[PDB]
Amino acid sequence: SNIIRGWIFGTTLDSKTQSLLIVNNATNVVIKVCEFQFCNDPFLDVYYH
């Protein structure tokens, strides 16, 4: 039933350096390599609303 979605990879994860995003939905993938600011425990859930 496809609970798993994607992965995150980096060195510092803190926008002082670049880091990379991998994600999935019903079929598609994006990969992106910005200086992402994340959080303590971010994720993607089913954002139904």
Partner: protein, 49 residues
């Protein structure tokens, strides 16, 4: 010269002058953060050496 030079100097062009370790092949370090030349730890934005 004939397209990238400027009479006031084309100081848009910048390069890294200091690094802890020499980079790996095809690495790209975008960090603008401070470097230490004196033995003291340095914080924020400036220091002696």
């Amino acid at each position: 010269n004939n397209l990238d030079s400027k009479v006031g100097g084309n100081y848009n062009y910048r390069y890294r002058l200091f690094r802890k370790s020499n980079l790996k092949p095809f690495e790209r370090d975008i960090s603008t953060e401070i470097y230490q030349a004196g033995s003291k730890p340095c914080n924020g934005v400036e220091g002696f050496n």
